Ligand binder design. Structure first.
Ligand SMILES: *[C@@H]1O[C@H](CO)[C@@H](O[C@@H]2O[C@H](C(=O)O)[C@@H](O)[C@H](O)[C@H]2O)[C@H](O)[C@H]1O
Ligand SMILES: *[C@@H]1O[C@H](CO)[C@@H](O[C@@H]2O[C@H](C(=O)O)[C@@H](O)[C@H](O)[C@H]2O)[C@H](O)[C@H]1O
Ligand SMILES: *[C@@H]1O[C@H](CO)[C@@H](O[C@@H]2O[C@H](C(=O)O)[C@@H](O)[C@H](O)[C@H]2O)[C@H](O)[C@H]1O
Lengths: 178, 37, 45
């Protein structure tokens, strides 16, 4: 009688242990996948960043109408994608967030390739892509002295602030280095 | 259950480093523009 | 890449192999490679 009851408690012990173990491994599996998720995401948050080589601007009449940004990968970065980035434009007048535009822009920005295959994705360290924003389509065409705070933000999370400072004089200067 | 506690703390250590990691870079970003000007 | 900011045009120059147009070409002055700086004494024009 006692032995029969022990076996019933035994098999119930087996099932309870299996469920407890099953919960343990399944929770471990969830945290393993979650734990793996942050390792790549946080490293891409830290490593993957935009690096701005230069910032020039076209000058028509007497005001800067196009703003040109040449960008590249950071040190030891993965594939930065410039079509999933959102540049922030805090200008002298307006203050909006620029999204990427195809073809084109207006309140959006376009990316033309300078060196490399892709014209929107930085694959290797040597690829350079030019970021195009219409200054006369986001606000008034930038005149002399105007300053723009440009915050390029990667998809994974990065910040490359560049204070595009228009030169104090545009006297007979077709293109100027902001 | 010792491994489960490790995993949650593992995740916490990752963001805490990531939170700390940002501050130097974004501060260096502000000073890189301030120094250049 | 060489960023040319001249009185008129203002573009970024890539590399070619002809003397070019909107590119630049490199001719070795002192050394083996005509495109790669390997030693401290290498000069390429
Ligand atoms: C930033 O890059 C833009 C890439 O399209 C340049 O765009 C061209 O500018 C020319 C001129 O205004 O300089 C126009 O004739 C082209 O149609 C226009 O695509 C822009 O000039 C430059 O600042
Ligand atoms: C860079 O980011 C782009 C953001 O739109 C990606 O764009 C998509 O790419 C898909 C495919 O992988 O080619 C297309 O089916 C989508 O229509 C296109 O928007 C791009 O892939 C990525 O490299
Ligand atoms: C020489 O000094 C002038 C002082 O008035 C400047 O003139 C102003 O320039 C502004 C801008 O910087 O382009 C315009 O918005 C003003 O309307 C204009 O009077 C001039 O620019 C400067 O070179």
């Amino acid at each position: 009688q006692v032995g029969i009851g022990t076996l019933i408690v035994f098999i119930a012990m087996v099932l309870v242990a299996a469920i407890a173990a099953g919960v343990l491994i399944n929770t471990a599996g969830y945290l393993q996948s979650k734990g793996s998720a942050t390792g790549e995401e946080a490293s891409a948050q830290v490593s993957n960043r935009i690096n701005i080589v230069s910032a020039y601007g076209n000058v028509x009449x007497x005001x800067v109408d196009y703003v040109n940004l040449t960008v590249r990968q950071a040190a030891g970065a993965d594939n930065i994608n410039l079509x999933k980035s959102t540049i922030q434009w805090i200008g002298p007048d307006x203050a909006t967030t620029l999204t990427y535009x195809x073809x084109x822009x207006x309140e959006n920005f376009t990316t033309x390739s300078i060196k490399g295959x892709x014209x929107x994705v930085l694959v290797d360290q040597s690829d350079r892509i030019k970021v195009i924003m219409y200054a006369x389509x986001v606000x008034x065409x930038l005149x002399x002295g105007x300053e723009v705070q440009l915050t390029v933000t990667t998809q994974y999370g990065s910040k490359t602030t560049y204070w595009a400072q228009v030169p104090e004089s545009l006297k007979d200067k077709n293109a100027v280095x902001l």
